[PDB]
Ligand binder design. Sequence first.
Ligand code: VXE
Lengths: 253, 253
Amino acid sequence: CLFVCRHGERMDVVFGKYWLSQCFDAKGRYIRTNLNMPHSLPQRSGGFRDYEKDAPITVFGCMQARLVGEALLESNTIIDHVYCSPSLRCVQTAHNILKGLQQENHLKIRVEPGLFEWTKWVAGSTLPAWIPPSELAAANLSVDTTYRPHIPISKLVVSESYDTYISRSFQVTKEIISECKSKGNNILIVAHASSLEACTCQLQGLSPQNSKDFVQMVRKIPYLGFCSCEEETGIWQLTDPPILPLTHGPTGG
Amino acid sequence: KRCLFVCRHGERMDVVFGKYWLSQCFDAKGRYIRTNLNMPHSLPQRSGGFRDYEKDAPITVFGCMQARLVGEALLESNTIIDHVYCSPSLRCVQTAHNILKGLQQENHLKIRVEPGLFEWTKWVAGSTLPAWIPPSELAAANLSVDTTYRPHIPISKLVVSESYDTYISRSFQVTKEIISECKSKGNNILIVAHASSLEACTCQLQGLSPQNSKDFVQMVRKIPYLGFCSCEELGIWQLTDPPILPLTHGPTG
Ligand SMILES: CCc1ccc(C(=O)N[C@@H](Cc2cc(=O)[nH]c3ccccc23)C(=O)O)cc1
């Protein structure tokens, strides 16, 4: 069985494309101005600019994930292997899920650029400056630095076509299921709203949807939205997920 | 100085899951079965059983967290809270309670439940008040509620479909009665109530004629969950910058 899910709430959504203008001042000192803003953002090799295209989750986004994980704990769902997209937001999410499972120390996360979302969405001709696992583990994030990626950064393409994405996802997935096959029977993926229809489209075996009813079906996926597949029967299908959803509204006004 | 802090309760069960939420988290024999991770681990039993919840519903999980955070935040600022009262709505007592829990003062501050801080009653459904849990019952639920507090406006003395002018007037008399009963016993006061409260309790406290009702309601709608204002004595009182930061997040989406 397989579990894919979307990341916590984003700081660049709640607070705007001009959000660094509300954290940071002249000398690049972080200054929180809302309570949903972390108390420290971690320091980045490149400097504060790497956020602009690689934003971290908000306080409530963490909680979203720490709750999902606690829920996994309560439902006696043992998670054997967890892989996440190199997006900062997808790493911070995954680390909190594990806190909730109380496995921040035991489990160690496979980072995998193959899980990232359709680069059509990236601004400009350039990818976000992802933190390399050595530097993520560096900020006290239970990450597995050893894990060699199955689709390296460099091997990815900088504003790709629709069916390049669906194939690299339904390609990366097929690899990850083989990777574990009898090293634990429960793998989770922390990734993106696009990830859920792209990776389990072909796993369950369906015929990918037009580039118009993907975007259709994707924007309808909440934060920490999350889905279950179950099969060596070679026949994978969706199962009612082992936990309940997490619907709240906004702060209001 | 002397200060009066008025803030609005947290996230409402019956806003995130609708007028018919009870139909979602309660089955036929009457067992509470939570269907969403934003619903609490369990609900406190009422004198009327559960149907008592549909006119006095409680805060959600993220509502609790919203108010645990305000309490964390006041305490981080070395803002000392000398006096907590609150509306008899469950949503406000529970919000009040988590504030104490993030202030690290559940075991020293006792919430003065005061029915005259209930919202304008033209907002109550039908023609009977909501079946508020009495202080003693709240103290019986680990809720740090002062059960000897003698109210200034008792429940029997609250009118039904009352007038805007009534309400502005009881909100003014209550606020002057709370302040005076605290004039020597301590420095800073926290009212936990409704969006209506933040205007209704403070407009005349600062020397002002009160807004017309249509404009009163336009202000009131702009107040978010845990919105939080602030008043300071010059016997006239002035609004001021809160001692803590605002708090914004959005839906789950
Ligand atoms: C499902 C029942 C349910 C849910 C939410 C609410 C809600 O949103 N209540 C407001 C106050 C208010 C109440 C009203 O019945 N009518 C209004 C009209 C204008 C402005 C405020 C109100 C608040 O919580 O402050 C009112 C009932």
